[model samples]
Target: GGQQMGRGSEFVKPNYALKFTLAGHTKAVSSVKFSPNGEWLAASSADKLIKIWGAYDGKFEKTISGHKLGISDVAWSSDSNLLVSASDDKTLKIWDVSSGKCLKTLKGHSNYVFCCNFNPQSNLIVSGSFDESVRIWDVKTGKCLKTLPAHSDPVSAVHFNRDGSLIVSSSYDGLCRIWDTASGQCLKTLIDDDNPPVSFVKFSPNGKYILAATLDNTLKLWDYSKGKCLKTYTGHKNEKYCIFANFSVTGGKWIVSGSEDNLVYIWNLQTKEIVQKLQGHTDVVISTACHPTENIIASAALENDKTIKLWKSDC
Candidate 1:
């Protein structure tokens, strides 16, 4: 699995196969993310619990529980020593990854918190909520630094770019906005022609582009600075839930997404071709995560499945 081939080795496509199936969450798994170092995987569930697992072997490591209501999203710090979770309880809680202890509970949102993520420096956290606001917090002091009335509807997703200088958020109101972190100013706003509800958004690895998931069953790559769409990837069913998607470089710059069709779809980033489709989930695949530096992906499903499947390059 480590040896190189001939001159064209780098361009060779991967044949991914099922590696492991993990089961622990009793309810729908909402989000799954691989640590920046690619050693651990954190999963948040509607059961009010967060579970940590060894990313290499899919072995259970720890369970964190403290939220009063269902959890919606989880993100790991840059150093992978800390984790933050958003919940229906209207708060975001940061946990010590090793001790499984709740260290800080940042409270400000008046409605359900739908999404959250740590900045690249691991010192700031950004979260979006049903309250139609996006808030930034200081990790060390547990202080809310800034709150932006981000959207007219629920903010379904939010993420920091590679440098932590910009933040992107998508909403049910059919718009995505890019904000300047320091000034809390909306720099650019993006919307499609049909104005479909947006469910998720992520920055490209280089921070030059944005990937947005819309309920119209399409994922559009936008040049945020220019406020223009560059590419569109579609083929999955996604009109019901807030299905998630992200960029994957494991096999030649691909886009991976969880679908309501009960399968995982991977597309060639530039060509918009459905290069591969991995199927195993018995229900809707709600979330997906790609390993930071490995040829692997982890996908989680809804209540009917309640399981996470790990896929690796078959080669």
Candidate 2:
């Protein structure tokens, strides 16, 4: 059954008429990411499993499964040899990618861990949880390094800037905040009074701007240096669940987002307008990621039939 479904997965590129499919997740795939070297693809699923496959052929190379509950998120180490997984079991575990051996389990969060990531320069793992806090952990020793209590509600997402200087988090309080990792201080907060709740926050490649997506069906771009919102992109009627507005790896000008509206919208960042809307998902889009070396974009839906769809633009 897995092999049959894997053979039927498809990729779509509307602008250039390029399309193909590669599937490996047996259950609801929660997260999808390309390795740092762009040679492998890792995916986490609600079936309590994590799968790593060859990026070029979709061949299943390994499956890391230990979580008693669903796997919430997954992250690759800077070297791409280690895999870390956050789970609904309220724990985070590190695994050896090659041997699929569970290395260490980092436990502390009282509630579900929503997301986790590794700092590029340090062997530290940072996780944000539904318990209304973010914790930093030492990857080597599995010790809790720091616990931040800035958010009044659950933190929906957490990400470190490319430079590892600043950590950004979005919460159920309708705010996006930036923190100084060195000082463990909350530097700035960007609030949206009219929005429902901010779900995700991502920094631009240059770190000059931050793009925040909210449950209010709005995406706001903020100037980090100026500490102000520069522009707001509005289009979706339902809530905007995930927003991934970044430059294409191929050096093109484009920003893409997926929402509860069941559509993936690509935008022209300079013009701040929707360029095209790609439709295929049958449920709310929960996550979106870009390829490290290709123009391809991947989006995951969150309803009954959880699946990740990949798309590319002709332009």
Candidate 3:
């Protein structure tokens, strides 16, 4: 199903065709991502609903609801059998994908829950909220396990490293902080005065590099081992909303992001080059995710021109 042709600047292009545009969500779609198995797709929206679709055939599976306000983000359990969502309703709810029922409602955050992630090993959930805190939860008992009370301002994003030993969060405080999951202690504070409203942060698939997307229109890569900054990438407009980033399927070959001016960008990992630019979304692009199995990507547009698109390479 794959092969290549060429080298360097003259590299032969992969046939990156726009396969499909997932048209749903009454309001703007906020996120669209493929499940780990690559068989199912889930999308969240400002319309206060989440829809699941068969990724391969585009079959509409079911709609998951209950959030009184707009949903912010969604995450899948390791088994891909359960899903979790964050909302402005100030709660994170776990759902059974097979039965399409919200099994547990974990409530603790005093403000809007903006981000959530499930630890593959423990099945526990870590959430970041507008309350300026990061909390860990036990999905089984619906109890908060640890409250790190991180970020002086509203927390924007939260993620666990590959093995789930460490956690990272980005905040409106202009900082991304690392935490010791075992002790619930602050390990390192990644900060810069001008990195205002650090919108999102995620770990590379290999668990070595950290990507921070800033509202100041830049993405900074962090070397987690040395606790230092490695490189900063640009060439996209992101100074207003919370744009997202992701590494390629195989690990660290590329870093991709959705942009504001109707563009999707892919940057080479080693050279820091903008290797490709994808266009089609009519409004701002906020969600950017790399497919887990193939040379493909999924992105969603925000506001009026709300839509979801998938880009695949047929090299």
Candidate 4:
């Protein structure tokens, strides 16, 4: 018998190519997200619209409307049948992906709702706002269950852990805090010595660590339980905008982030070396979304560039 290596067990640096340019949002695109089930890509923008497209081909599929002001972020439900959008309108709207109907408009945030995400079970939603609060809502009734007075300044990003037992939030107030989801109590707060304002934060896919982008122009991977920084990735400019960053979706082998220098930067997850720089946008690239099952990435840029570009890793 001959020995054979398991498929996809080895790692290789990917060579990416521009596949499609989606010209839909008229204003600066704020967020781009792929559906968890890997079928749809939703892009939200300051033009007050959310557009849906085919994840594989980038074909226009639907437009979600009705936010009074610019939309800030959008997250897909675990089942991929629903989408929740945060807006400068100070509200979050839940929409049915199939019928394109608004199912619920969650209103309570006093200021702009900056970020939102669905729990893994799809029964709850967590939203962070400029009002400096983090709210957890019941998916069934659209009722806010718990409101954590999360920070001193605007809350920039919020997300639930893999098991839905914990929530992590970042803020302009210069810290990232982990909360017990059920009790709505702060379990731990993570911060650096310089206290640079955190622009975005997310729990790793395995829920053991947090990846945070700060104003110091670096992304730090933190061992949340130990309150220590495991690795710091640099080379991407991020001093002014709240640029987003995340671990590569499928294997967690790479770290990806949009750059204020009009590029997308990818780093080796363990070695922390800049492996690739993607160029297409003419302005600051504000957000990047990794495809759940494929080696594709969707990037959206700021005011001067109101387009979304899809890059596929061919190697």
lDDT of 1 by residue, 113-175 (tens): 999999999899999999999999999999999999999999999999999999999999999
Q: What's the best-to-worst order under TM-score? A: 1, 4, 3, 2
Q: How well does candidate 1 score on lDDT at residue 170?
A: 93
lDDT of 2 at 232: 76
lDDT of 4 by residue, 171-243 (tens): 9999899999999999999998789999999999999999999998999999988999999999899999988
Candidate 3, residue 181: how far the Cα is off, in Å: 1.0
Task: List ranges where model 1 is wrong by over 4 Å.
Answer: 1-11
The alpha-carbon deviation from the true structure for residue 174 of candidate 2, after best TM-score superposition, in angstroms, is: 1.1
Return the TM-score for each candidate structure.
0.96, 0.88, 0.93, 0.96
Model 3 misplacement above 4 A: 1-15
Minimal lDDT window, size 10, model 4: 1-10
Whole-model Cα lDDT of every candidate shown, in order: 0.92, 0.74, 0.83, 0.92
Give the better candidate number (2 or 4) by lDDT.
4
lDDT of 3 at 136: 96
